């Protein structure tokens, strides 16, 4: 009962150390940069075939094939160029809230309210997709899952934990603990040596894949954090929460860099992604549309409207050619 | 144009046909979301069904009068209910189970859960079937202990009928949206057929009112 004093002292020292480093501000540094233009993005494609709310999507590493998960109990693999359905996978549990697509493209993953991460093998000799693995051990719903190197996968759960698995054996190689609320999303670093998890305790944590330790903790939000992504450089990241503000933090300075908010916007944020160069920030909102922010000036550069319900999933191709957004009206749209 | 892309398009069209057929088959089934406060007779209601491995959500299928019902039990989640309740926005009905024999202020927790569920922004115009289990234990306890121990405002006799009616009214008075949704109440009895018949009647009424909304008659 005497250790709370030491914890408060360490927290105050950390806050003062962060204060000492704030010699300038990103906005007053980049105000001299000429602003990016008013952006029009056109809907090149619309993918139909889902009969319920689409909860997750992920792009292939070739930036042509994508996977979408919908609570009609379906995983659909689309060829975006021709809007063809390569594969349709029926799930044992209709309550799917996440999906991933392997970097090699051999497997896909899904999970949800069944606390089990199912891994499906796309390339089989029998000509059909069959369940390759069912990783179990989480005591809450799966919120996100990301493939590392086609044999291990990182998952986050609603029991305030994350876990790194071993698909070959099915055992939790590592368990990341330290969050207080449910972990809603994780983002994988470009080198796949670190990752960031945002939780419902209005905090984000930077875990190291090896040693299973939390290196930095970032606060500043006022509500549940729903989405997270890395800057393409890998030295900064962005978060979206329920208080209708995005935030951009950096790893090296260990504190916030910028906030993206507008007086008109009051609904929460579901999805967040960057651009290929990192100049633009795509954010999906509950008010049925998407917003493109200038990552260096915090001014809204564009609006992507055309979804009749909450925009739940959003992704940008590896080559940066297109942006795919999916909402609760059971449609995915490719924008360019 | 297309050399062997015609075969790819034909495969896509067969996929579309199978998806449409599966959606049609799934659209003729009833969805019930089973909710309760601390396992207050939920299992007994589940036992009326006739037809660590998993811990997230439990499925229960049954058929009554050729109609197929699927019941979803989410009692083993123990996480933020606000982060996954919106998944059940389109269920045909909710089935809320409450134990009448209540002992440490459990009825107050049950009412708090009922208030949080009925007045949720996702469950507008979604009907609730309220089961009040353990009527015989309620009889015995109300014979022994008075209802004032839970409700200081109560000013009625210790008779089973008046106490049960007061509890039912106390639960039904938490419904703010008295117009767009309805609450069906049934004191659960030992007979197996009665509970399923009551659920079938409530679901039939819900389907009828949904059809009136879709037909433009409201």
């Amino acid at each position, epitope marked *: 009962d005497q250790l709370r004093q030491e914890a408060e002292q360490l927290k105050n020292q950390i806050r003062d150390a962060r204060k000492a480093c704030a010699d300038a501000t990103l906005s007053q540094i980049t105000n001299n940069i000429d602003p990016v233009g008013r952006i029009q993005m056109r809907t090149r494609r619309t993918l139909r075939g889902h009969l319920a709310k689409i909860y997750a999507m992920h792009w292939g590493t070739d930036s*042509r*094939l994508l996977v979408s998960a919908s609570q009609d109990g379906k995983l659909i693999i689309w*060829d975006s160029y*021709t809007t*063809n359905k*390569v*594969h349709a996978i029926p799930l044992r549990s209709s309550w799917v809230m996440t999906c991933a697509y392997a970097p090699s493209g051999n497997y896909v993953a899904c999970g949800g309210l069944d606390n089990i991460c199912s891994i499906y093998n796309l390339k089989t*000799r*029998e*000509g*059909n997709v069959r369940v390759s693995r069912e990783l179990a051990g989480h005591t809450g719903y799966l919120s996100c899952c990301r493939f590392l190197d086609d044999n291990q996968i990182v998952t986050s759960s609603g029991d305030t934990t994350c876990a790194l698995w071993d698909i070959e054996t099915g055992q939790q190689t590592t368990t990341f603990t330290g969050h207080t609320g449910d972990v809603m999303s994780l983002s994988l670093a470009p080198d796949t040596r670190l990752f960031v998890s945002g939780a419902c305790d209005a905090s984000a944590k930077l875990w190291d894949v090896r040693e299973g330790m939390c290196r930095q903790t970032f606060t500043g939000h006022e509500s549940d954090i729903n989405a997270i992504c890395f800057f393409p450089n890998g030295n900064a990241f962005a978060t979206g929460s329920d208080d209708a503000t995005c935030r951009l933090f950096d790893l090296r300075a260990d504190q916030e860099l910028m906030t993206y908010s507008h007086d008109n916007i009051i609904c929460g944020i579901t999805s967040v992604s960057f651009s290929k160069s990192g100049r633009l920030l795509l954010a999906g909102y509950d008010d049925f549309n998407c917003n493109v922010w200038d990552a260096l000036k915090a001014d809204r550069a564009g609006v992507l409207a055309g979804h009749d319900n909450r925009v739940s999933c959003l992704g940008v191709t590896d080559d940066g050619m297109a942006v795919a957004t999916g909402s609760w009206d059971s449609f995915l749209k490719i924008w360019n | *144009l297309s*050399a*062997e*892309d*015609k*075969a*790819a398009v*034909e*495969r896509s069209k*067969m996929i579309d046909r199978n998806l449409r057929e599966d959606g049609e088959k799934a659209a003729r089934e009833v969805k019930l979301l089973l909710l309760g406060a601390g396992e207050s007779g939920k299992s007994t209601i589940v036992k009326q069904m006739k037809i660590v491995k998993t811990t997230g959500i439990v499925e229960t299928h049954f058929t009554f009068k050729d109609l197929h019902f699927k019941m979803f039990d989410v009692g083993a989640q123990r996480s933020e209910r606000k982060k996954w309740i919106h998944c059940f926005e389109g269920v045909t009905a909710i089935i809320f189970c409450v134990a009448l024999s209540d002992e440490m202020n459990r009825m107050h927790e049950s009412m708090k859960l009922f208030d949080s569920i009925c007045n949720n922004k996702w469950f507008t115009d979604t009907s609730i079937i309220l089961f009040l289990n353990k009527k015989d234990l309620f009889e015995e306890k109300i014979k022994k202990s008075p209802l004032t121990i839970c409700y200081p405002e109560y000013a009625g006799s210790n008779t089973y009928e008046e106490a049960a009616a007061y509890i039912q009214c106390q639960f039904e008075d938490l419904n703010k949206r008295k117009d767009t949704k309805e609450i069906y109440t049934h004191f659960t009895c030992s007979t197996d057929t009665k509970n399923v018949q009551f659920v079938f009647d409530a679901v039939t009424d819900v389907i009828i009112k949904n059809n009136l909304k879709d037909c433009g008659l409201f």
Partner: single-chain antibody
Amino acid sequence: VQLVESGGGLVQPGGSRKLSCSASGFAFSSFGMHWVRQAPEKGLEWVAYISSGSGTIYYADTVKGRFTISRDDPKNTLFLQMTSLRSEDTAMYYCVRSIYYYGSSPFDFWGQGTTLTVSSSDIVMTQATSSVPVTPGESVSISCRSSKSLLHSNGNTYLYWFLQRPGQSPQLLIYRMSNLASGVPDRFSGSGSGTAFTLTISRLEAEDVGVYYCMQHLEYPLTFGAGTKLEL
């Protein structure tokens, strides 16, 4: 996975037969099916194709009208009902599966073939070389040439390389002129441009000999061209 053929034998001219192809070990309903023909001591020759779900059916010009391909999916069987048998239909018949989506490998598995004996095509592809003497320590190049540009407007060149070992059925080596089939040693490679294509073997072994064929999959007649023989 295996395809097993039945129904061969000796037939008088003008008769009729029905060849059967039983498939086990894979999802038969998802694969389109081909009947291919090989005359005695001659090259391969495409005969018939039936889609998945029996949607589209294609026949060769020389067998159209007197042949009929069909499938029965509940029993996983493929039938070729042939009538008005001439003396030019004596050959061995192979049953080939082929599934088409983005990034698939059609023609990957071939059946064993059944022998049928009878008693008394705007794209032509030429393999000018007929035989090559080799030793199991060098690199071999086999050239194929087309009468049309196999490159399509979507960036895909539709050329397939098959290998037939002595006494066996052909196996897919390369699909779409660049991609190695599953379970093929890395020593094989393919390249080309539009109308001239090349197969390259870096270091041969005792099992690299046989007859090599280059098929086209641009226009559906699906001509083959006489293969190139590698021996010694």
